[PDB]
Structure formats: C-alpha cells, structure tokens
Amino acid sequence: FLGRTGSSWFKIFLFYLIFYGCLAGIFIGTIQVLLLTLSDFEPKYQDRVAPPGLSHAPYAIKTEISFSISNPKSYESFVKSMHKLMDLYNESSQAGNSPFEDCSDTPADYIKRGDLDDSQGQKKACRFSRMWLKNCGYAEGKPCVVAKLNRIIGFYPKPLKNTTDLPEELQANYNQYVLPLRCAAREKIGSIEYFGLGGYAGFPLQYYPYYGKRLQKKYLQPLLAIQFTNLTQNMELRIECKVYGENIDYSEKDRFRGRFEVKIEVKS
Amino acid sequence: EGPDNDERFTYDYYRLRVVGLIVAAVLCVIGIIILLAGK
Amino acid sequence: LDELKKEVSMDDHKLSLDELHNKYGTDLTRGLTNARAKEILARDGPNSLTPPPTTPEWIKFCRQLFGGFSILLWIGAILCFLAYGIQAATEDEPANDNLYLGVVLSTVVIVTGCFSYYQEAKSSRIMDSFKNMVPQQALVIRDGEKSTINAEFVVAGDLVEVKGGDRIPADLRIISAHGCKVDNSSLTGESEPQTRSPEFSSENPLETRNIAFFSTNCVEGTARGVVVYTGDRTVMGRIATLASGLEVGRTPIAIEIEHFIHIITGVAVFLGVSFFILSLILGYSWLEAVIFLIGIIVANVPEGLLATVTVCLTLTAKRMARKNCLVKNLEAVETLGSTSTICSDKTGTLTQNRMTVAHMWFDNQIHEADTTENQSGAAFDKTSATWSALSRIAALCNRAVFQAGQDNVPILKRSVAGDASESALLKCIELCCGSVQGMRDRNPKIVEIPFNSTNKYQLSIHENEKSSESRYLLVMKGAPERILDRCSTILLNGAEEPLKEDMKEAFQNAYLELGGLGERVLGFCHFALPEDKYNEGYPFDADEPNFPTTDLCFVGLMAMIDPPRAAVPDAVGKCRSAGIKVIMVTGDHPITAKAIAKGVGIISEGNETIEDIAARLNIPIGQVNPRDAKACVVHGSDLKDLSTEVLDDILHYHTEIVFARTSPQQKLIIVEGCQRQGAIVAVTGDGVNDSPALKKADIGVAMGISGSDVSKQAADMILLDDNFASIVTGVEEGRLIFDNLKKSIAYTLTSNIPEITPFLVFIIGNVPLPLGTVTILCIDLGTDMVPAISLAYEQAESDIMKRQPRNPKTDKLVNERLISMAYGQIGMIQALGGFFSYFVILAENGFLPMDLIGKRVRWDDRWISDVEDSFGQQWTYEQRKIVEFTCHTSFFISIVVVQWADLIICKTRRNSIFQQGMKNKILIFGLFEETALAAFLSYCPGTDVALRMYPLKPSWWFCAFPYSLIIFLYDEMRRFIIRRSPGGWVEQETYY
C-alpha cells in the first residue's frame, strides 16, 4: 500500500489499539486518585477568588450600557439579563420551611449552620424578596442597575468600623451588620439612589457564610438595586460602584475586584 | 476559625517566589559545577 | 558548458620552429612588433583569468527565509497581523497579543535564517589562487630587444624568455634552451625537475620537452619560447575555469534536512487546514478560526530544531579543530561519515613527498631502512664493517647539504639544497651515523667528477681520515650495472674478495627485487689507491682520466622511494574495514603508483591485474579472463580513449583500483564516475592538479602543511598536521553525529504533541485553553534548547567503524519509525501528563473536570464577571484567567518534567541507560538549567505580564511525575525487546 503489507498494517493497528487503550486507562486512573483527594463540600484552594468580585445584571457590551429612551428595542437587550436574574428571586421559588427560612427584615449578624459537613440536610438559607428592591419592564429612562457580591464558601464579609474617617462619612452607618456600596464618578452629574434589604445600601450579613452548592442548593445571595435618575443626557458617564470592608480589596488589572465599571449613556 | 477564618482565602505567594527563585539559582549553580568538570 | 574542459588538450609541439612562427605571425629572433603585439592584445584579450560570476550574499540569506518552516512561520506572523488588523477596525482592542506575537514570530524567522545561512557556507576562492600563479611581469623580445612587461600584456606569438626562479607566464613553445629544468608539479603533482629543450620528445604534449606551461616554474637554466596560449586558453587556465566553474551541489546532510522539513511541513499543513475547516463546521467565526490556525502553526513547527542541528554540527567541528582537522564548511562534518568511496592522490597525501632510502644491499643481504617520518621502525645493521664502507661513500660521494639554521627541526623534515637522491642519502647517513659534515671534514675532498649524462657515475677522491694511512681514497656511485662493470672485488663482511659469477648473480637478483618494489636503485663502490703510486702531493686530473676507474671494489646497493606517511597503511585498512572503497588517483608513473598501492594496502596481498596473470602464466593478456583480476592499474593514456560507460565497468568490476598518470580533468572524471554509481565520494589531495576533483567530491580533504594554496581552496576540510589518521577519525565523527542528530530530532519533535493536542481539545471539547502560543515558544526556544544540543555529546552505542556506510537512498535521518515513536507513543504520553496537571489546577480551584466541557463560551466572555464553578462560587473575568494562565504555566512545567525522561531515553537508540550510563556532563547540565529556567520563568516577578507565567504551588510540580516515569519504563522495556530479539518487530517499527 503506502507503507506496509496488510499483515503489517494489522499489527500496527492491534498495537496502537492496546497501547492507547492502556494510556487512556492510566490517564483515567490518575484522574480517579485526584478526585479521591478532594472534598465534595469545599475546594482545596480559595486564594484565587479571595477578594470577592462585584458583578451586575445589565450585560455590558464593554463595561457599558448605552441606549435611547425614545426607543423601545434600544434597552430590551439589558432588560433580558435584568429579568434573568430577578426571575430567580420569585416568591413561588421560596416556598415552605424547606429549604428556606424567614430571616430578620433588618440587617443582622452571621448565621452558622455548623460545619461544611453532610451531618445535616440542606443547610437552610435566608429568604430574599425582590420586593425589597423598590422602584425595580424596568427603567426605560435612567436605568435601575442591580449589584451582587460573588459567592465564596465560608466567606464572612466584614464591614469597616467607624474608628476613623470614611467616604460616606458616618451616614446611616450600620457598622455592625452592613457591607456598604457607594457609587461615584468631580463629574458629579447624576443622582444616586440605593435600594436593598432593610432599606440600607449594603448586603445583610445574615446571608453568610455561604455553604456551597452541594450543602446549600436554591440558596439566595443578597442583591442591591441602584438607580441613576441623573438629570443629564447624551453623554458617557463613567460610574464606579465600590464596596467597602475588611475582606474587600481591589486591583488595577481586575476591574471587577469588589467594584463596578459602568458607562451609562441615555442618548435620547 | 469561625468568622475570623481569613487565612482560608490567603496564600503566601511571596515566600513561594523567594523559595522558587532560590531553588532555580541553586540548580543553575549545580549545573555549572557539573559542566565545568572539564569544560 | 564545462564538458569541453573535461577533455584532453590538443597542441602544436609537432610543428617545426619556423612553421610555428607562420601560425602566430612571429619572429624567432626579433620577436613581435610593438604595434603587432598591441594589435593581438585587442584581438585575443588580456593574458589573465576572470573569476566566475558569484551569487551575492543578499540572495543567499533570503533563500533560507523561505524553506518550509520559515514559510509556515511567515504565514503565522502575517496571520497574527491579520487578526490584529481585523481587531483594530472592529472592536478597539487595547491589547498587544497578535501584534507582538507577529513581531516575535518574524524575528524567529530572521534569526533562524542566520543559523541556516551559517550552515550553508561556501568559502571558495579557486580562481584567485590560480591568478596568483601568473607573474606580475614577463620578459619578452620585441623589435629585437628584451623588455619587462605586465604579464597580462603578453599575447600569442611573442618571444618570451625565462630563467631559474621565475614563473612561466604563459604556455610556450620552446625554441631555445640551455640547461633548462622545470617544475611541472602543477600538472602531475610531482616536483622532480623536468628538462625543457626545443626538440619534440613525445606525441603527448603534456610529456614533451618543447612545451612549457603556465602555472609552473623554471627551476634552473634558461629558455626562450613562443607563446601559443594565453589566459583562459592555457592548459591550466582551463583547469582553473573547470575547477572554479563546477557546480557545488547539495551535501548528504543538507538533503536529509530538506527531507524531514517536507515531512513535518506536510503534517503541519494537513492538521492546519484539517482543523481550520473542522472549526468553521462547528460554527467558529473567522476571527477565531485564524487565531486557532496561528496556534496550530506554532505547535507543529519545531521552532528551535534547525538551529539545534547547526549548533550540534558546530560543536562536532570544534572537537575536530582540536585534532588538527579544520572544517571550512559545517556540513562537511557529516559527509565523511556517509562516505563509501575515497579517491586519493598519492604524492604528498599517501606519501611524504620526499625521496627516502628504503633498502640496502651489502654482504649478499637485503636490509630495510626505516622510511617513516618520526622513525617508528627499527634498525637494520650497524655492526658490519661493510656498512661503514658503504656509509662513507654515501656521505663522501655526495654534494648535498642542509640549509642553514635547521638544527632545530628533525633530520627528515629539514630543507636540503640538492637533487632528491643525494638528499635521501644525506638524511640516511646523518640519521644513523651522526653529522655528515663531520665525515666530510675528516676526509677532505681533493678532486671530483660530478655525475655525467655520459659517464652515468659520480666519483670523488678524498684524504683518508685514518692517521696511519692519510692516503687517497676513491669513491663512486651511479647506475648499478655501470658500477658493476668497474668492479673486481666485493667488500664482504669486512674483507675483500674476487667478484665471482655467483655474487654477480645475487647482485642481479637483489637489483631486480628492489626495482620491482618501484624503488630507484644506485650502485656504490670504492678503491684504496696504491700509496707508492700516489704521493701525498700527487695531482689528480678530473678532465682526463689521471687515475684508474676500473677493477674497483663493489661495496653495495642502495634503493629509495617517496615513501608512505607512517599512519597511511593503517588508516587505509581502517577505511576498508568500515566498508569504504579506496581508489588511488595519481599523476605519477604506473610502476611507482602500483608499488605504493601495495605498500599502503590499496592493493591487498595476492590480488592481481590482468597483466600480472599474463606474466605469471606466461600467456597473452587477451587470453586472460579479465574477471579473474580484482585489481587494476589504468594509465591515463588509455583512460583518454575510454568512454564513461567503459570507465563505469572498470569501477564496478574491480575492488582494488589504481588510476596512474592521470591529468586533472581525468581525476574529476573518475570522481564523477564513482558518484554516477550512487556513491558518496571523498577526495584526498595536496596539489593544484587535485583542484577539480576536490571541488566535485562530496567532500574534499586537503593536506595542510604539504598542500598547495589551490588545493586548500578547493577543499571542505584541511588536515593541518598532514595526519592521514584524521580521515578515520573524521568518518567516525561523521557517523556519530548522524546518529546523535536522530536522537536530538526525536527529542525536539516529541514535545510537539503536548503542544498540538491542547489546541485540538480546545475546539472539540469547548474547554478553557490548556496551553498558550507564547508558552510553546518558551519550550522550543527556551527549555528544550540545551537538552537537545547535549545529545551531540553522546558516545557510540556500539562499534560504528564496524558497520558499512549508510545507504543515502534508504537510511534517512528522519523516517517513519522516528515519527511513530516521537508523535505516536512518547509525545502522546507527554500530552496526557500536561492535561492531567491542567485538570488538577482547575479542580483544586473549584472547576471539576465534568463541568469544564462546553464552558469556554462563558469562560472567554469578558462581560461575564460571575461564572459559577462546581461548588457554586462566582468568578470575575480576570480571576478565572489567572487560574487559566496558571494552567498554562503548569502544563508548560509538565512538558519540562516529561522531557526529563525523554532526554534520558533519547540518549540511546538501542542500549539501556544502565549500559550507556550518565557520563554526558552537558546533558546533565541541560537538565539542571532547563529546570532552573522553568522555575525562573514561573517565580520571577513581572513574568506574569510579559509571558503570562504564574507562580506554581509546590504540589503542582509533581503532577507529571508519574507520566515522566512511565516514559522511562516504557522506553526501557521496548529497547529491552529490541536487544533481546534482533528479529525485527519492535526494531523495524520503532528503531529510529
């Protein structure tokens, strides 16, 4: 033929069949032992998610949400993702004492449901009403963005203490139980309005620590609705929403490390 | 610890780099020694 | 074009002096007119040689920039700029990826260009050396007056004059001469002075006395002649053009390189476009379809391989430089290993090029002297009183002297003023009797008759050094038979005795044997003149026989030859044991050529020519079956009337071939004949008459000390110490580097698979990219470099000089067996070890292997800053990318770890590491430096930006260890099978 005879062509096939078969069987074996060394409830390493990311619902083309108020299908793209998220926080999804629980309607302290063990059933998560998100189809004019803190197993988000000076200096400082979120731009051509649990501009600490998908399915993380009823129009406004805390940090590279990058433009 | 389990989300990449560079250097020296056993 | 120059020349030495003048419109006495000479100048053109048109270095450099790998890397470099252009227009990408990767790849092409350019070097100044043989000026007779002119202004027809010490300015017809002798070594390779006279003495113009040639010099006397040829039209000017004009051609090693380039280029374009369409079918945007292709290019092309080859060659050439063997062309480092036939000059190559005493006949006994340079033999006789009598004649009846200031150099190497035979005798006595000058001071010469053409002997009368005598001793030497007709007694073991027919017959026997050995034989005799008949003041007349020259006492015979170099016989046998055929090709006479052939082992004992059979059986040569003769001796005059097909039959039908009295073109023809049969041929030589053959040879080797400038220009390799044993070393080195290149190539190729497979699974699986493009270049250009080079220092696995020369048609540098092992077996195991570490990193950060399938869409989505892992956690864009790049880093390090084992297995093709050992210090160096580089690239701060290399956790380093070990075991088991059964299965499938 090309290389060899039929007899040789066969033998080279019988070899590579057994050979690659063995190699596949060995590869699988090493994957088995790897998995055997891992927990079902907690990942081996968590230093790469460490400082929590802050992500929002409006799917930004490039950290930007520009549209026209005087146009219907101009914002119907951002309403798709906005709906996708809030559709999960339905009351019909949170039914019965299992696996949900009614928690303080005001920001409270942490809740420990034991260890990362299966020695108990599904760890009961705090309910969250999308109805706590006042004012927010969504904002056809002047968007109503929804913030979110990235989930990390066993992470206890710790707010800053009012020992020294603060950006939003001491205003509504629920020091003990709220992780604040203050959006900014100089360039003050807007109108910041925050909505959340208990009416506070933060995340209620009663939703922590997260026990993971395996130990807490259907779990709901707290949301923070933000509305920009800015009196300006037809210009790119670089708005940055920042979260503050002891376990919260940022990076010049990762522009989502505990903060937002939104470029709103109501070009109408 | 409980609420004070910050160490869980931390890794000393600084020491690791110091050690890694020490090792790389020493392996580089060892190599020179064996090569220079005759030039 | 040069087929005309490969033919024997035609001449006009047969014409009379007068007749020759009519042909050139010339005067025998007055010479040309100033006007007629200038007319002929403009007519024929200058008496000069024009160098052939060369290829500029520009075109030579750029021709490498387009050879398979460079072509693919160019397509990659441009395709980078393509994707970059498409980006800069569509969505403003502030990145530098495609732009920088395009710059990097273009640089890789340029630098790789320098390496191949350095390897494909051609240092040739043939025509320049020939031009150096034309004198600046010549002496001509014009308008009846002699004047010096620019030699280029010399034309056919003018009257030229030459004298001892000057170069022949052009081909001349001798019309007048006085004691003129010439050095024709340019045409023959033999430096013994040849007389020139107006008389025609041979039909063959290269042998006649009435022609003098350009490229030669007058050694003594004076001559006048008419110019018959000028410039390019001279006999050796044509040799110049032939030699300088010959097409170089591709080396065996070069052909091998291009061959695997085709193979690897083939699989590259195959998988390249095979997956380019496979991606579009899967609905991949052309924006991405090209990005994947660039990666495929980088994965398939072994970026550092061609440069490795060059470095391995260079390092092998450095070792040979350290044995006095200079390599002018890097590729010639390997040709000697692939050589199946050596065509060797004799004089100054196989031989020392110095008349040396070989045997002596005295006391009715043949004695042998030591002919070797360094005198590696033993003594023959010292005791016999006869010896001292013969020794005295050899010293006394000798007019040769050592040049001043030689006392530092060895006797046999020092320059001597005199003819070759007298120098030989001088050096013979000086060696075994101490200072000859002393013997010539103790015995003052009073009268002598120098060797005469008519007398055929030379005699001398000396004052006997003996005090009790202080009388007159007569000594003489000459033609053995002439000396015999002048002897009455023979000095036997001390005492004289009558010359009976018995001893006279033993003389003839001794004389015939020595002459049969191709040796020049001289007779020696002396006579103690009677005291009473010769007073202490008796005057001797040298002009008229004033003393007896008959009834003298015969002392002995001495024989001499230009002997082989000490190492030559043994080197020839070693070449022959390695299955290399050795042919002699010489300008010298057949009797001498044949005798040295037997001396060095070109013709082995018992082997006969057709002429030998005929003489032994006493039958006509036509009655001899030529197939009964494995040896042959072909004279150039017969070679001339043979067609190449008939030359091919000679080459095919004889194992032991001697081509004697060959011209320079004839040497070229013999070389081409050998090549025509498909053989790789080496030429060894030292003369300008070797230049064409040296050029045409696959590898020409010139002698460094004895070699002429031309020969060393025509060669690929120079033996700086004239050590012929270096050929044996060269062939051995050549074979070793050939095997080691295979090892180094397999090693380099093996790591291609773990660079290809990640890109494929990226498409077919939709998982995050396991390894990056930049990461690949960190391997092929970084870590694999020193290890791959180090394989060039591997010792032989067996006695390589015991095997036959490779068949260049069947035995390739890269074959299917190499690809099967590197791509199909070992590289495949490396790929898995890479993937394993990849799955380990991701799973330990929360992305278990199961959830990875079909996630790249959301993974690469820059706007999704919340991807959910297996544990329900949410990752931003840059966070997951850090883990991904950490995956690139550990996959990279996994390659390094699996290359550890590969380096050790590529060490040996057959033998076990437990047999070959770990005595390669460069290899061990490679292991340490490779690992140091990898660690540095991962842990050095800032490398996460420039190369996207991230620090690895200690446990990460060990992921591929079980795969590294399986490689070592697998290959060790496999080679154990090879050795345990030379049959073929494992062998014919995987044995590189």
Ligand SMILES: *[C@@H]1O[C@H](CO)[C@@H](O[C@@H]2O[C@H](CO)[C@@H](O)[C@H](O)[C@H]2NC(C)=O)[C@H](O)[C@H]1NC(C)=O
């Ligand atoms: C989650 O809540 C949303 C609230 O808008 C539900 O949307 C409803 O969709 C139905 C049918 O398309 C409409 O008739 C209603 O007007 C919507 N609102 C309400 C309050 O009922 C959505 O269907 C819910 N999703 C799930 C899975 O239950």
Ligand SMILES: CC(C)CCC[C@@H](C)[C@H]1CC[C@H]2[C@@H]3CC=C4C[C@@H](O)CC[C@]4(C)[C@H]3CC[C@]12C
């Ligand atoms: C990523 C995976 C799916 C690709 C696997 C590719 C396999 C099928 C390839 C890789 C190397 C290949 C082999 C390389 C060498 C030889 C020897 C040659 O004389 C015949 C073909 C043969 C035997 C090839 C057959 C196919 C082969 C085994």
Ligand SMILES: *[C@@H]1O[C@H](CO)[C@@H](O)[C@H](O)[C@H]1NC(C)=O
């Ligand atoms: C939000 O909606 C409420 C009614 O639910 C209305 O009273 C109020 O004006 C709205 N706020 C703004 C800022 O438009």
Ligand SMILES: [K+]
């Ligand atoms: K490669």
Ligand SMILES: [K+]
């Ligand atoms: K050559």
Ligand SMILES: [K+]
């Ligand atoms: K490679």
Ligand SMILES: [Mg+2]
């Ligand atoms: Mg010679």
